Amino acid sequence: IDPTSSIADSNYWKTEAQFSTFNVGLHALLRECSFNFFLLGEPRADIYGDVPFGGEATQGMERLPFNTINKENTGISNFAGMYKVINQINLMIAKTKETTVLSEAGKNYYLGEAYGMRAYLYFHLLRSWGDVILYLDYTNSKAASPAEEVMKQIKEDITASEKGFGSDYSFKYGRYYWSMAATQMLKGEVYLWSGRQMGGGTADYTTAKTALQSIVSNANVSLQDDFSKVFAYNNKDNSEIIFSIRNAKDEYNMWDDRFRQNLVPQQAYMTSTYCNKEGVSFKDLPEGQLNGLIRLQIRYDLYNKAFRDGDTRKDASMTAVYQKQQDGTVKYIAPFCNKYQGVLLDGASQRSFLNDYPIYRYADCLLLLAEAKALLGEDPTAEINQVRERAYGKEFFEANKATLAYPNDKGDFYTDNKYMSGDEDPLEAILKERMREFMFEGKRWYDLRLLGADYVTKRTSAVATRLLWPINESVLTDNPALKQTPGYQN
Ligand code: NA
């Protein structure tokens, strides 16, 4: 037998079917980073931070909403596991550039996917750690590059991805594989970040607008009429999805079981103690199938401060927990995530958390395009109201346009509301719309960060010197050329 079999050995690159298998494998390595995509993009912001209602300890997870991560407890370690994925993409890239077995079309589509994914991972690294090492070759000591050089590489990889796809906006392998529309969404985000956080200005906002407009024109995408069906177990493959992480029976639980372990309530206290608004014990309801732990607790007051009446996204996003009082009344306790309801497998007693985790969907294209328009001093009204109309329902929205349609959603609802403000300011209206549309989708922290330090420090406990993440001890030991992130001394 062979004592030194490696994945770079030529016999594993002899057929198109092998390159396909290796591309499936790359999407499976990206999926291993999916819990980290959520942690990087959301819980440092304002949605969490209250005490788990049922009694759980938070066991360090509070360090995210409290922004108390530091050199001893970094919250996430080892650059979120991203370099392992990047190394393997780098292998795909060299093998595809070298092959004599693929069609020119097929080789170029693979290069579109692999350059897109590599840019996607470097852009999480840039926004989270800043200066980071640029590894571009497969390997079976090194200093980080300045953030400005990281951004150069991400933009080069976007251009190489576009070159690979050409004019093909199809989802060749489906919406759970990378495609041109995913490259164009990342291009919109990257040039907004370049333009706003790295001094690119108007020219970059125009690049971002042109990319997002290319998805509206050329990709097969549409808003689902029912916001809850965007996330339903059965309705994966729906045409609002641009790129999603596919979770599946016997393949991968959502966030490698860390959705269940952080955001799903415990069956024991739900069935023993709590009830719905009508006083019915959860022992008696489909909720009695949920069995996880709450380590990140949505702020109790967010449940009534996030959404205007009539917004269908409130019930799709959160369930409220109540408790019967000795005096007989039913009292509101706290909310839990209802966006990802999993499935009850045949003959099971507890839910399985097998929803896909969406990375890019058409409402995000529309709201990014609104943001690029607003940053250019142009009118964001049409995109904002396309997304609101879906949220409220067409007829209800039309009847109530003088209070719900942009730029009329303002007034008393906002007065003591730390989460969101009225439509009188375009960027606040868009932040507000993104907060309502993408709870539990890993966006809020990055949405504040793009707009700048003052937006972050206003609404979060983060301070301006510590917007990046620290680096854990084992990383710094293993690589003497790396420095701790700035802001994280003493
Ligand atoms: Na603050």
Author numbering: 18 to 157, 167 to 516
Q: From the publication, what sentences describe this entry?
A:
It comprises a predicted β-barrel protein of the TBDR (TonB-dependent receptor) family, NanO (neuraminate outer membrane permease), adjacent to a smaller protein, NanU (extracellular neuraminate uptake protein) that has homology with the SusD family of proteins. In the present study, we present genetic, biochemical and structural data that elucidates the function of NanU as a high-affinity sialic acid-binding protein that works in concert with its cognate TBDR, NanO, in sialic acid transport. Specifically, we have established NanU as a novel member of the SusD family of proteins that binds sialic acid with a high affinity (Kd of ~400 nM). Therefore NanU, together with its partner porin NanO, forms part of an integrated sialic acid-uptake system present in several Bacteroidetes species which we suggest as the first sialic acid-specific PUL.
To characterize further the NanU protein, we determined the crystal structure of BF-NanU to a resolution of 1.6 Å. The crystal asymmetric unit shows clearly a monomeric form for the protein in agreement with our gel-filtration data, and an overall predominantly α-helical structure, reminiscent of several other members of the SusD family. We also report the structure of NanU at 1.6 Å and reveal that despite low sequence similarity with other SusD proteins (~20% at the amino acid level), there is a strongly conserved structural homology based mainly on the presence of a series of four α-helix-rich TPR units that define the scaffold for the structure of these proteins. With the exception of an extended β-ribbon and turn (Met344–Cys363) in BF-NanU and two small two-stranded anti-parallel β-sheets in SusD (Cys94–Trp96 and Ile323–Ala325 and Lys172–Phe175 and Val185–Lys188), the majority of structural differences lie within the loop regions. The α2 helix defines a motif pivoted around amino acid 50/51 (extending from Glu33 to Gly58) that is well conserved between the putative NanU proteins (residues highlighted in grey text), but not with non-sialic acid-related Sus proteins, namely SusD and BT1043 from B. thetaiotaomicron, both which are involved in oligosaccharide rather than monosaccharide binding. A second structural loop in SusD, seen to move upon substrate binding (residues 292–297), and thus provide a critical tyrosine-mediated contact, is present in BF-NanU (residues 276–280), but there are no structurally equivalent residues to the tyrosine and tryptophan residues that co-ordinate ligand in the SusD co-crystals. At present, we can only speculate as to the binding site for sialic acid, as we have tried repeatedly to produce ligand-bound crystals using various ligands with no success to date, but it seems possible that the observed differences in structure and amino acid composition may define the binding specificity of BF-NanU for monosaccharide derivatives, such as sialic acid, over the starch or oligomeric sugars observed in SusD family protein structures to date.
